[PDB]
Amino acid sequence: KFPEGFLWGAATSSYQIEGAWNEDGKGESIWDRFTRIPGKIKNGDSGDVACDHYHRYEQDLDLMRQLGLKTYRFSIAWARIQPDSSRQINQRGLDFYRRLVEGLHKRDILPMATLYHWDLPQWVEDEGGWLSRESASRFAEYTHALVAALGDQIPLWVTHNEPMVTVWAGYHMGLFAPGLKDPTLGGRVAHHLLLSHGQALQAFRALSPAGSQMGITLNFNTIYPVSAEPADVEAARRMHSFQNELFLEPLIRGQYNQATLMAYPNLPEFIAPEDMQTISAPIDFLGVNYYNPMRVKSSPQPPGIEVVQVESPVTAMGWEIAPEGLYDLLMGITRTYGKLPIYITENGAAFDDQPDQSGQVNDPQRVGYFQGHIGAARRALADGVDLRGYYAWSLLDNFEWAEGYSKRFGIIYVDFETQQRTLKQSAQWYRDVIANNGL
Ligand SMILES: OC[C@H]1O[C@@H](O)[C@H](O)[C@@H](O)[C@@H]1O
Numbered sequence: 014k015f016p017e018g019f020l021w022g023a024a025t026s027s028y029q030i031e032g033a034w035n036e037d038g039k040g041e042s043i044w045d046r047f048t049r050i051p052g053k054i055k056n057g058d059s060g061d062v063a064c065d066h067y068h069r070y071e072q073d074l075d076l077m078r079q080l081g082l083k084t085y086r087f088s089i090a091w092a093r094i095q096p097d098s099s100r101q102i103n104q105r106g107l108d109f110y111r112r113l114v115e116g117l118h119k120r121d122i123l124p125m126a127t128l129y130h131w132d133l134p135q136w137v138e139d140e141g142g143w144l145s146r147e148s149a150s151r152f153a154e155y156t157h158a159l160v161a162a163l164g165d166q167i168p169l170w171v172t173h174n175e176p177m178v179t180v181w182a183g184y185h186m187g188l189f190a191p192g193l194k195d196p197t198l199g200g201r202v203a204h205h206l207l208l209s210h211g212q213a214l215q216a217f218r219a220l221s222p223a224g225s226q227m228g229i230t231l232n233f234n235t236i237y238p239v240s241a242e243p244a245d246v247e248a249a250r251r252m253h254s255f256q257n258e259l260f261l262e263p264l265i266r267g268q269y270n271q272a273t274l275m276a277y278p279n280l281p282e283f284i285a286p287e288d289m290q291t292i293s294a295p296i297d298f299l300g301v302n303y304y305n306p307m308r309v310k311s312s313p314q315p316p317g318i319e320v321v322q323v324e325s326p327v328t329a330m331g332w333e334i335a336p337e338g339l340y341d342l343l344m345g346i347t348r349t350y351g352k353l354p355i356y357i358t359e360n361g362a363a364f365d366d367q368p369d370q371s372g373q374v375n376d377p378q379r380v381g382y383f384q385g386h387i388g389a390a391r392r393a394l395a396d397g398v399d400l401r402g403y404y405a406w407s408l409l410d411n412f413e414w415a416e417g418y419s420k421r422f423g424i425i426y427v428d429f430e431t432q433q434r435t436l437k438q439s440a441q442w443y444r445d446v447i448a449n450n451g452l
Contacts (some may be wrong), residue, residue: 014451016314017389020123022084023077023349024035024359025324026130026174029411031090033067040096041397042132043142043374047190055155058417062393064409066118066420067109071433074116076425076442077408080440084123086112086358086404088130091137094171100151102158114166123323125169125358125404128156128213131179131189131414138191143179143202143209146283157220164222170337171300171358173212175232176206177261188415200277207263211291213329218294226418229264230300231360233257234307235338235345239321244311248318252309257342258349265350267293276316299346300358303329303386305406306338328382328407329420336385341395343400354399360386361406363413363420366437374426388452409434 048059060240093106229286252271410423
């Protein structure tokens with residue numbers, strides 16, 4: 014059994030579920046724009062409608078209640094709040110989150126809100142987006158507004174979701190909005206993401222909302238060398254420092270690591286005198302997102318590291334299923350950076366789900382994923398990790414970014430033609446886990 018009061022949840026993000034993309038005075042986000050670009054998204058899909066959750070949120074709140082969720086992690090669409098460069102608050106957008114949060118509490122579900130889950134308002138992008146240091150101040154102003162409005166109604170706040178993905182997918186690879194493909198920008202962007210977190214945290218501390226805490230969510234891929242050879246070991250260590258500690262090192266220690274400074278030699282040009290102190294001010298908790306490990310070998314070619322693909326066992330995303338990677342990640346963070354409070358803010362899997370003739374959605378592979386991963390999380394808790402909660406990604410099948418609707422991560426099936434929701438077997442199973450407070 015997990016600890017009494019352990020927070021079992023499920024997670025979503027705003028662009029992935031809400032729809033209502035141009036309703037109620039919501040401004041365009043960089044993802045509204047990105048999804049109009051032909052060729053960027055599988056099937057030419059977008060989040061224009063998604064799960065239609067902006068309209069259907071009460072149905073989704075009842076589904077959360079049906080499962081017995083203790084907590085629900087969502088993100089806030091910044092462009093619903095500040096549609097445009099006037100910076101004026103859009104009250105209808107704010108009201109939606111107020112109604113959502115009130116509905117959570119009415120059902121005894123603790124809200125966890127992510128301020129930034131990738132859907133930057135286009136107006137912030139027009140002012141430089143994360144290339145501009147001033148975006149950190151815009152993000153702090155957005156945070157201040159939301160925490161002034163809802164701070165003591167939302168007990169757990171996360172600033173950023175997965176800043177490494179914003180850097181890599183958004184600026185290195187152009188896979189995600191805003192679609193830049195210039196690896197030399199990644200340090201600058203990383204710094205400004207971190208600075209925005211620090212300034213948002215400052216805003217949060219100044220407001221000091223009763224009973225509320227703020228952290229940040231980072232993704233990680235536990236790294237294993239492909240062999241015991243020294244060069245593979247060295248490549249794996251360098252890849253871990255970059256892949257897994259690019260953000261944690263400055264957040265906890267107030268410095269960038271060497272792998273990061275090597276990757277982005279101009280990074281120190283963006284660091285003003287008090288930025289590292291601001292970035293490293295204490296967080297209340299760390300959000301951990303984990304799906305899969307990465308297997309590394311050395312290479313002779315720059316940068317001397319190769320990630321090796323794994324054919325099996327994998328999910329529909331081709332991501333290796335290795336629950337021991339979750340245990341090892343948690344133990345490593347805890348050993349390296351100390352026993353701070355951790356929430357697993359995402360863990361889950363995509364499989365090709367299909368209703369049967371009777372309308373049931375039986376997803377045993379997803380059950381098996383959760384069984385392994387929740388079990389690994391329990392072992393990490395038994396071995397001294399301060400794990401406070403676990404959020405299944407996702408409550409709902411949703412818009413999976415550049416994969417569009419080709420990937421289903423929900424524990425609840427969504428027919429996107431009719432918006433019908435059906436609990437999958439995994440949701441039924443998870444309800445039982447919550448009720449038992451463990452496996
Ligand atoms: O890809 C599955 C999930 O990966 C996570 O990196 C993101 O935070 C989610 O938005 C995404 O749906």
